[PDB]
Amino acid sequence: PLESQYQVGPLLGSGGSVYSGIRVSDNLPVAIKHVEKDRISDWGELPNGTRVPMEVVLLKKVSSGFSGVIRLLDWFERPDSFVLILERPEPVQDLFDFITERGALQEELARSFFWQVLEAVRHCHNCGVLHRDIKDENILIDLNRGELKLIDFGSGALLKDTVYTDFDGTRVYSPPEWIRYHRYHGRSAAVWSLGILLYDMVCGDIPFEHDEEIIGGQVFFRQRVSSECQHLIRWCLALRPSDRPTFEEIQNHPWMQDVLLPQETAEIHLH
């Protein structure tokens, strides 16, 4: 009984389609995401053997406990679609719109956001999940708590140590080894997309729009950015995957020290 357990509100957006909603049981704000079966790329199976979109498999693997990941609360199957019930922060703004409205972010704020994204991606990898579409569009800001949340695992995969030869994420966040050879390893590709994301935050837009820029390996800074932040970005965007930092090396980097707490981030920068 899906139409009798949630009250459906306005469209949030589409690409499937996502609606705002309220769980009738306890007025919990939710998001209601509709996925068309005819569009499902990769399929998986639950423990029960029931075949579901891989997105549902990945979301279940990361939705245990609290984290900076949007949690799946429930899901339903329909004749031609799956319906996903997700948490919904309120008030919320995605990081793309946030950067559009505010311009390049102060480094203190970019540091807090980037730190929280790294903790969220670490949690995904610990749960066996590779997101494969890290970008400002896929990050929500809980404006009152100052907490960031990863969304949209529809391009993700189970994490493995061997080479990936498929990709359906965002090309301008994809690494040069995907552009050149249609091959990448999961962790170093993630670190590349995190370098794009960090440049995006401190410069106000992504560095590369074209394949030639992605493989050229030259990072021009269009805004005043500290030498320490430039170095971290350029390290994340190393052309050779094995030259990129691990997550531990990113979080131990000097630019990453003395991060603000989420509550402080909201009070200083979002309220």
């Binding site: 970008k135 391009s155 966040y173 837009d205």
Partner: peptide, 8 residues
Amino acid sequence: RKRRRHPS
């Protein structure tokens, strides 16, 4: 210059 979203 033009900042835009990029679809997957």
